Amino acid sequence: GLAQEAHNVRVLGSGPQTVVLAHGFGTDQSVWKYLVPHLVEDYRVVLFDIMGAGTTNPTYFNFERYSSLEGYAGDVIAILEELQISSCVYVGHSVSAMIGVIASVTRPDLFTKLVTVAGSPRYLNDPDYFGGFDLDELHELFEAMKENYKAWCSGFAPLCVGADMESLAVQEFSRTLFNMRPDIALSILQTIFYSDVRPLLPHVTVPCHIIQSVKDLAVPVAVSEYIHQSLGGESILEVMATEGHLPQLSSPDVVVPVLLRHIRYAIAR
Ligand SMILES: [Mg+2]
Ligand SMILES: [Mg+2]
Ligand code: NA
């Protein structure tokens, strides 16, 4: 299939229950490597890479399509229809959280449940909302990406994963970051940091399970609280006693059980 080839779609497990695992910026579907073995016995598991990941063809990259998160939401829908999947649980890491939120407002029929890991509808600050970042901070971040991409990746990965340089996850993430073509990495990260999905949250109807590390460089806990307060369907908040923006990769011993519970169980009342 077209989307299956372009997004490295892999379908594992078995059964009528389907779980889609969608990774965030700088990594790929390997971010789920410790969760997948605990799902395949009970679920059909759909893995894919978002366009622009270092595992995808950079000559392909459609800069206009991916200048807005709507392009990534369209990709999710196209993958499910190409796979003829009419219903799934969608687990979205970082940017893939809001991508699933957007896809669920366009096509609520495709999702029985959203599970977000370190999602945020807005990273910039305004007088009534603290996203965590201001404009000149972002400017200097983007200039570092342009000036020395390898040095940027090497400094960014430990801060993002929230661990020392020699952490396994830091080293994995350093490598997947540096496999992105620098102009594509910059374009995607600008699309992410300048997004605003806040107006869409009240229009969500799919129940959402909102997960993050208590200490996440990219997501203040107050943002997760804001998501819970703004969503138009049922939702539950579970802040984890972990540090890091890729907690399913760096702290799987405790984060995999959290994800399993929220994939498996419905919100009470
Ligand atoms: Mg991201
Ligand atoms: Mg206001
Ligand atoms: Na639904």
Residue numbers in the entry: 2 to 270
Kindly provide excerpts from the paper associated with this entry.
Strigolactones (SLs) and karrikins (KARs) are two classes of structurally related molecules that mediate signaling pathways to stimulate seed germination. To elucidate the structural basis of ligand specificity, we determined the crystal structures of ShHTL1, ShHTL4, ShHTL7, and ShD14 and compared their structures with those reported for ShHTL331 and ShHTL529. All the structures were highly similar to one another, consisting of a canonical α/β hydrolase domain and a helical cap.
ShHTL1 of the conserved clade is thought to be the ancestral ShHTL paralog. Only ShHTL1, in the conserved clade, was capable of binding KAR1 (dissociation constant (KD): 77 ± 12 μM; means ± standard deviation (SD), n = 3) with an affinity comparable to that of ShHTL3 of the intermediate clade (KD: 78 ± 3 μM). In contrast, ShHTL1 and ShHTL3 were KAR1 binding proteins without hydrolytic activity toward rac-GR24. In contrast, ShHTL1 and ShHTL3 showed no hydrolytic activity toward rac-GR24, while ShHTL1 had weak 5DS hydrolytic activity, which was so weak that 5DS-dependent germination was not observed in transgenic lines. Due to major bulky residues and the arrangement of the helix αD1, the pocket sizes of ShHTL1 and ShHTL3 were restricted so that there was only enough space to accommodate KAR. The structural alignment revealed that GR245DS might cause steric hindrance with L142, L/F190, and F194 of the KAR-binding proteins ShHTL1, ShHTL3, and AtHTL. Therefore, it is suggested that ShHTL1 interacts with ShMAX2 or AtMAX2 nonspecifically, while the interactions between AtHTL and ShMAX2 or AtMAX2 were induced in the presence of rac-GR24. Although the KD value for KAR binding of ShHTL1 (77 μM) was higher than the physiological concentration (1 μM), this result might be because the fraction of active protein in the sample was lower than 100%, resulting in lower estimated affinity than real affinity. Rather than the KAR receptor, ShHTL1 is likely to be the receptor for KL, an endogenous signaling molecule that shares structural similarity with KAR, in particular the butenolide ring.
